[PDB]
C-alpha cells in the first residue's frame, strides 16, 4: 500500500496524512438464472397415457411443436420395456430444441420389437412401418398385455402381412386392395392366392411375454435448418442468498446480493423499482417469494501513514464496507508478503467510516493527528505503531464560578502571531 501511495503521489516521499489510492470492488462469485415454473410441458401423456393405440399398419402420427418438452419423464420413468435413441444422447434431450416432432404410436408383438430399428427387415419393418437407416430420434416400447389382450383372442389390432413393395421410411399404407399373390388376378376378390391383406394378432392373456402385445411409441425429430419450435425445460439454477452473484430472472439481468425480503407485491407485480427507478426487489418466477437487491461493495481504499521521513509502516482504510469484505479485494493476486499482511489479522478494527487494518484501537483520547472520520483519528506513537483513537475535543477545564468572586489579572504578556493570506495568481493565458 505504501508503494501504491507513492505511485499515486508521483513521489518517493510521502508526508503525514491520509490519501485515497484505489477502489475496493467485490466481484461476483457465481451466476444465477431463474425462469418460470415447470409450466406447460408438451402433451406427452396424451400419447403415452392414451387408452387405445392405433394399429401397426395404421400407426398414429402425432405432431408436437411450439411447446417445452420435458423428456426427463421419459427416461427418469422406468415404465418402458425398451428405451433407445439414435443420433442424440437421451440425457441431452432435455437440453435440445427441434423444429418439429412426430410421435408414431402403435402396438406390435413383443418379439417383433427388434424389427423397430434402422435397417430392420421383416413384415413389420417392410410393410407396416419402415425406419430410415440414419434415424434421428428415440424408440420407446412397453408391455400392454393387460390392455391390448382379451380372453378368447383380441382381434382389434391389425398388421399388414403382404404388399407389393417395402414401405419407405416414415411411410404408411392404409389401402387394403386384395394383393395379387399369384399369377391369377384377384380383381378385389379374396381367395386362393389372394389373402386378407391385414392380419389380426388375436392377443390373449395366456400369450407369452414375447407373444403378448406391446405398445410402442417412436419420437422422430425433424431438423431442416428451420427455427426450433420445441425446447427442453430451461433448467433454472438453484437459489443463492447473502452473497454477491450475477442473477438473471426471466431476462431481468443484474448483479448484487439477494436477501430475504419483507415487501408485499401484488399478485400481478413482479419486481419493484426504487425512487431513482433502479430495480430494488424481485420475485422468483419458479416460486412466489420476494428478494431484495443490494450493491456489493462500491467501496474505496485509502492509506493512512505517517510521513515517510518518520516511519515506514502504513494502515489501510476500506471505506463504508464491512470488515469481512476487506480481504475480498481480489486477494490471492497481490504481493504475498506485503499486501496480504494487511488483508486481515488481529489488527482489524471497525468504524462508521469503514474497516481499518493496521491500527490498534486504544482507549486514551488525543488531539486529532490524521482525521479518519466519524470522530475517529489515527496517529503514530507508543514499539512504535499506528493507533486509532477517539478524537479529544479539547482539554478539560472548569471555571470556579461564584456569585461574588472575581478573577483580575496581575501581569500581562505581549504575543505576536502570524497570519498568511493569498493575494493573487499567476497570470496565465
Amino acid at each position, epitope marked *: 500500500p505504501l508503494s501504491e501511495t507513492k505511485c499515486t503521489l508521483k513521489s518517493f516521499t510521502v508526508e503525514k496524512g491520509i490519501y485515497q489510492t484505489s477502489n475496493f470492488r467485490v466481484q461476483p462469485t457465481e451466476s444465477i438464472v431463474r425462469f418460470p415454473n415447470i409450466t406447460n410441458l408438451c402433451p406427452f401423456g396424451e400419447v403415452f397415457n392414451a387408452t387405445r393405440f392405433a394399429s401397426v399398419y395404421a400407426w398414429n402420427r402425432k405432431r408436437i411443436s411450439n411447446c417445452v418438452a420435458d423428456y426427463s419423464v421419459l427416461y427418469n420413468s422406468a415404465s418402458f420395456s425398451t428405451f433407445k435413441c439414435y443420433g442424440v444422447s437421451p440425457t441431452k434431450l432435455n437440453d435440445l430444441c427441434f423444429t418439429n416432432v412426430y410421435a408414431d404410436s402403435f402396438v406390435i408383438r413383443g418379439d417383433e420389437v427388434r424389427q423397430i430399428a434402422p435397417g430392420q427387415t421383416g413384415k413389420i419393418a417392410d410393410y407396416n412401418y419402415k425406419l430410415p437407416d440414419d434415424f434421428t430420434g428415440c424408440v420407446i416400447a412397453w408391455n400392454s398385455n393387460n390392455l391390448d389382450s382379451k380372453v378368447g383372442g383380441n382381434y382389434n389390432y391389425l398388421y399388414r402381412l403382404f404388399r407389393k413393395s417395402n414401405l419407405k421410411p416414415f411411410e404408411r399404407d392404409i389401402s387394403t386392395e386384395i394383393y395379387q399373390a399369384g399369377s391369377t388376378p384377384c380383381n378385389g376378390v379374396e381367395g386362393f392366392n389372394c389373402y386378407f391383406p391385414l392380419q389380426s394378432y388375436g392377443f390373449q392373456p395366456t400369450n407369452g411375454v414375447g407373444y403378448q402385445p406391446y405398445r410402442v411409441v417412436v419420437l422422430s425429430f425433424e431438423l431442416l*435448418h428451420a427455427p426450433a419450435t420445441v425446447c427442453g425445460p430451461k433448467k433454472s439454477t438453484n437459489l443463492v442468498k447473502n452473497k454477491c452473484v450475477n442473477f438473471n430472472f426471466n431476462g431481468l439481468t443484474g448483479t448484487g446480493v439477494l436477501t430475504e425480503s419483507n415487501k408485499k407485491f401484488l399478485p400481478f407485480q413482479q419486481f419493484g423499482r426504487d425512487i431513482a427507478d433502479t430495480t430494488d426487489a424481485v420475485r422468483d418466477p419458479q416460486t412466489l417469494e420476494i428478494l431484495d437487491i443490494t450493491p456489493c461493495s462500491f467501496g474505496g481504499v485509502s492509506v493512512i501513514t505517517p510521513g515517510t521521513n518518520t516511519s515506514n509502516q502504513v494502515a489501510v482504510l476500506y471505506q463504508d464496507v464491512n470488515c469481512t469484505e476487506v480481504p475480498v479485494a481480489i486477494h490471492a493476486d497481490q504481493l504475498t508478503p506485503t499486501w496480504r499482511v494487511y488483508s486481515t489479522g488481529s489488527n482489524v478494527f471497525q468504524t462508521r467510516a469503514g474497516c481499518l487494518i493496521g491500527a490498534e484501537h486504544v482507549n486514551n483520547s488525543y488531539e486529532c493527528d490524521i482525521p479518519i472520520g466519524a470522530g475517529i483519528c489515527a496517529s503514530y506513537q507508543t514499539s512504535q505503531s499506528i493507533i486509532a483513537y477517539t478524537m479529544s475535543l479539547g482539554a478539560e477545564n472548569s471555571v470556579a464560578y461564584s456569585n461574588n468572586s472575581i478573577a483580575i489579572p496581575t501581569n500581562f504578556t505581549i504575543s505576536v502571531t502570524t497570519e498568511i493570506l493569498p493575494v493573487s495568481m499567476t497570470k496565465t493565458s
Partner: nanobody
Amino acid sequence: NSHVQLVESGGGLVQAGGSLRLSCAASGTISTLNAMGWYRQAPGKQRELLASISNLGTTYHADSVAGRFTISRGSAKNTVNLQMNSLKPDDTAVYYCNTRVLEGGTQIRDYWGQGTQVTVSS
C-alpha cells in the same frame, strides 16, 4: 485442422424463367450433418432460409421458394444440391449454405460457407 467447411457454387445471373442448380460441398471434421440447409442473404435483405434437408431425408422449402426450388442430398450425403426451376426476380440474392453438426452428442454447431450470388433481371 480440418474444421467443418462449406462451399457454395452454381449461382449467377439468369434470365427470368430460366433454371440453375446450386451445389453445396461440405468438408472438414464433419461428424454428423443432422440438418442441411440453403439460405439467401440478398443485398439489403436479411438472410432467409429457402430449402433444407434433414439427415432423415425430410425436407423443408420456404414459401418464397416452394414449388420452384427442389433440394436433393447426394448419395455421399456430404453435398446438397438446390435445383432452381423457373427462376423469378425474388431469387436475386447471395445464397449461403448451412449445416448443423452434433459434436459430442450435445454441441449444436452451425457451419456456413462462402456463398454464391444469383441474379434475375427483366
